[PDB]
A = this chain, B = another copy of it.
Amino acid sequence: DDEYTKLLHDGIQPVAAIDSNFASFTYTPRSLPEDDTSMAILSMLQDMNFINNYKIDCPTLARFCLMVKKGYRDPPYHNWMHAFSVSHFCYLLYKNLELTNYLEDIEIFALFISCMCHDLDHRGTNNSFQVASKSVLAALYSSEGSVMERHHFAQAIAILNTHGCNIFDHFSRKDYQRMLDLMRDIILATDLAHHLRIFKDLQKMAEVGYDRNNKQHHRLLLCLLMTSCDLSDQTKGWKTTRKIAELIYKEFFSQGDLEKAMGNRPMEMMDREKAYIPELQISFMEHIAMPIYKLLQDLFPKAAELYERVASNREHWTKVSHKFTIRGLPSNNSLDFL
């Protein structure tokens, strides 16, 4: 009630007022208090001129932002602060990379909105868990795959179909259909299996050179950009990436505990008795995150620093891995842990 009232009547605060470094790749959006994030979303939308350009109703946009935020639960990693930080990176790509020379205005808008919605109602477990636990979400979507991603998309649509929240409701039939198709494609691209399926096509696109007149290049670029936002925690400083690791493994390990309770053997990365965090993170950096940011660098020369930071963080896991071995005694001078 009161949150909506202040967003609506206080006016959209200037983006520069959030932090002097807010538009830099070195800014860490997790630094912003959660209570200030809904206004920051409106400030970013305004700074990208989407509110004016698409003549978005302000009461409707306020209601939509609050409803999207309210649509996240609170597991350790897949919560609203993740969606907010993913959306922020999308803003950073816009401000720093000149996306308008590559993408249509409506595609950029859809990317940002998709970022806000892309993990809606996440329950802290992955696609395989849905299927193994015979969840309602799997009853609905398992035959199509990307179970959680389909749910996230369905949740975004349900918000738009809530009276008072359809920020697109004045769009023409064609523009409305375009927006919803984009949101579908972008949200589904956050599944790893999807990314692995298109990786060679992404390589081929970077090799031949981006063609702005090629519809398929637009679609491929949107997928790559979405994935670069989803993984953007890795482009920050060491301290950020370390904290994020903690949150991700806490969540992964909770899942593994539930799998064990159902009589299943969890994947090693979900198994708190077998997971060795440094190797797992080095592998993620080397085999998944680094190639994504190397691709981004191939397409946007100004994205070079991003790849350099992810590479630097990968190096830091190597340097710190020796500390995971217990030399001497533990701090309590006891071998009670056996």
Contacts and interface: CB of A to CB of B under 8 A. Distances in A.
Interface of A: 242-243, 245-246, 249-250, 253, 271-277, 320, 323-329, 333-335, 337-338
Contacts of A328: 249, 253, 271-275, 277
Given A242-B338, A338-B242, A338-B320, A250 B325 contact: no
A325 B323 contact: no
A141 B254 CA distance: 62
Nearest to A270: B328
Contact of A326 (B253, B326, B335): B326
A326 B325 contact: yes
B242 A329 contact: no
30 contacts: A243-B335, A245-B335, A246-B329, A246-B333, A246-B334, A249-B328, A249-B329, A250-B333, A253-B328, A253-B329, A272-B327, A272-B328, A272-B329, A273-B327, A273-B328, A275-B328, A276-B325, A276-B327, A277-B326, A277-B327, A277-B328, A277-B329, A277-B335, A320-B338, A323-B337, A323-B338, A324-B326, A325-B325, A325-B326, A326-B326
Contacts of A271: 328
Contacts of A337: 323
Contacts of A276: 325, 327
A271 B323 CA distance: 15
Contacts of A338: 242, 320, 323
A335 B246 contact: yes
Given A271-B328, A326-B326, 10 more contacts: A242-B338, A246-B329, A249-B328, A249-B329, A250-B333, A272-B327, A272-B328, A274-B328, A277-B326, A277-B329
